[PDB]
Structure 1
Amino acid sequence: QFVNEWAAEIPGGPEAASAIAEELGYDLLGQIGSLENHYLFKHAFHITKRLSDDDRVIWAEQQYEKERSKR
């Protein structure tokens, strides 16, 4: 169900997301689609919480597989 990917909203920009990755011990995979300030991290509510509590992260969430039907 859950995967080893975390999405975080970081208003500081890519430089901020880069420092976030280094300090906390994550892998910055980059910007998510066209969402300028939404980034995906590789490294688990504790892993999610650590990201959210940072004052540079406004929103964080672990990715999880969803059932999607073709019509």
Structure 2
Amino acid sequence: GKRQFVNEWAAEIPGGPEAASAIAEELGYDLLGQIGSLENHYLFKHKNHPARSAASAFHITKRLSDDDRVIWAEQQYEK
């Protein structure tokens, strides 16, 4: 069938793991850890957005991507 989005975001943060934790705190996420195919790819879990929704939360992605420490960000679909 079709998949819903989860309240988790992947992001590329070249500044590294300390920056990842600082970004999470500032923008309202828990850091989940490292993912992806590159070293400085991190997964975040938003502290307030619903765990599961059909909504594509483009506005949260834009806030994350708009931080200059974050060069790329992507809301994740559920598995």
**TM, length-normalised to structure 1:** 0.84
**Contiguous gaps of at least 5 residues in structure 2:** 47-56
Could you report, residue by residue, the CA deviation over 1:38-67 in whole angstroms, capped at 9, with x for unpaired residues? Answer: 00011111111110000000000000146x
Q: Which has the larger radius of gyration?
A: 1
Cα distance change on mapping 1:55 and 1:33 into 2, 3 Å: closer
**Contiguous gaps of at least 5 residues in structure 1:** 67-71
Over 6 Å off, 4+ runs: none
RMSD: 1.5
Number of residues of Structure 1 aligned to a counterpart in Structure 2 = 66
**TM, length-normalised to structure 2:** 0.76
Q: Which has the higher helix share?
A: 1
